[PDB]
């Protein structure tokens, strides 16, 4: 829901299928009450119960595909106004892409029996929770930074946080998935030396994620030190549902751009200065 709310304002377009997405979320919630046996496939329940659990688990992906399609479609054929929030939403979508595939692959009975309670499951859980949920939380924080804090965000430090945080999740989850394909048991205090490379890569990714968190904290501090009023990019018209509205938005944007671009040297003067920049010559006339 956070990602869906962030996307509509950035693109100034209607959502793809609001009713369909709401119904899909409700159906996914209803279906979640029937996947109890999925996480305990190796407990050895009755084969009928195992088959029913596996069939319910496989059918659960039906709502998620609808949500992904709705997000992708709403992202298209719109007036994109790139903000810091948009990049976080894209990162959240990208993270959710891999997690769904990992969960669907783990839904296979044979694959689960081959990887139950292992580093593959650990990676699936982390990428589904640490990646998607925390990324969406950060996106909503950036999407509503003004109302919560009262000041505009710090562009440079926010970009640094969005860069380091997004990379760290993949850096720490790729080696985990690789070890899961190698069958590394979950909740292990030590491993054979054969897992050292992937473990070290995962540790480095975790350290990068910590650095990204520090960067986000520095971004909050810089935003507090900035003390500059924020202005809604929609300017009160989040949807140009009318030609008059679009024209008024364009006129106001041009006026605000001219006012903002005041005191900046003109194009000709800037070009002349840039051309005459080099002033270090040896012998003159």
């Amino acid at each position: 829901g956070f990602i869906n709310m962030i996307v509509p304002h950035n693109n100034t377009r209607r959502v793809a299928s609001k009713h369909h997405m709401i119904w899909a979320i409700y159906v996914m919630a209803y279906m979640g009450y029937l996947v109890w046996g999925h996480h305990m496939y190796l407990v050895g329940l009755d084969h009928r119960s195992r088959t029913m659990y596996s069939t319910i688990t496989i059918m659960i992906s039906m709502p998620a595909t609808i949500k992904v399609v709705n997000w992708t479609l709403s992202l298209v054929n719109g007036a994109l106004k790139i903000d810091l929030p948009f990049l976080f939403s894209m990162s959240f979508l990208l993270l959710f892409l891999v997690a769904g595939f990992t969960g669907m692959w783990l839904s296979h009975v044979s694959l689960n029996v081959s990887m139950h309670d292992t580093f593959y499951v650990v990676a699936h859980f982390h990428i589904m929770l640490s990646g998607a949920a925390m990324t969406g939380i950060f996106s909503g924080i950036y999407y509503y930074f003004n109302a919560l804090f009262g000041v505009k965000y710090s562009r440079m430090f926010g970009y640094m946080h969005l860069i380091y945080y997004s990379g760290g999740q993949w850096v720490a989850f790729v080696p985990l998935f690789y070890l899961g394909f190698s069958g590394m048991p979950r909740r292990i205090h030590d491993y054979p030396v054969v897992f050292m490379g992937w473990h070290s890569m995962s540790t480095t990714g975790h350290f990068i994620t910590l650095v990204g968190i520090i960067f986000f904290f520095l971004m909050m501090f810089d935003s507090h030190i900035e003390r500059r009023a924020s202005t809604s990019t929609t300017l009160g018209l989040p949807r140009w549902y009318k030609r008059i509205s679009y024209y008024i938005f364009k006129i106001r944007y041009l006026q605000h751009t001219k006012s903002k671009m005041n005191g900046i040297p003109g194009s000709t003067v800037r070009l002349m200065l840039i051309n005459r920049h080099f002033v270090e010559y040896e012998v003159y006339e």
């Binding site: 990992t102 194009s267 800037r270």
Partner: protein, 99 residues
């Protein structure tokens, strides 16, 4: 040096058809330094093809071909007979694939 044989004296600004490299960033007359230009889009079209499409469908296959060609699928040499030995298959889990 005023007189330079082989170098025609510069008398005025030449048309943009004489430039040796098409720059990307442009100057909007309001004083802006625009990076997003049609030339920028055209230049960004090529590289994106290499990453999004090319490597994502050729890296794993190329690597497997090179490994099997040069490393013989990493097989141990001291075997008795291929008729009664386990076949060491080549790379099958795609490294370029997320899974």
């Amino acid at each position: 040096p005023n007189n330079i044989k082989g170098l025609i004296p510069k008398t005025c600004r030449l048309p943009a058809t004489r430039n040796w490299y098409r720059r990307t960033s442009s100057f909007e007359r309001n004083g802006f330094f625009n990076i997003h230009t049609p030339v920028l889009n055209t230049k960004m079209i090529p590289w994106l093809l290499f990453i999004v499409l090319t490597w994502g469908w050729s890296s794993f296959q190329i690597g497997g071909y090179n490994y099997e060609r040069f490393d013989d699928n990493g097989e141990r040499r001291n075997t008795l007979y291929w008729k009664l030995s386990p076949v060491e298959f080549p790379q099958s889990k795609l490294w370029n694939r997320p899974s």
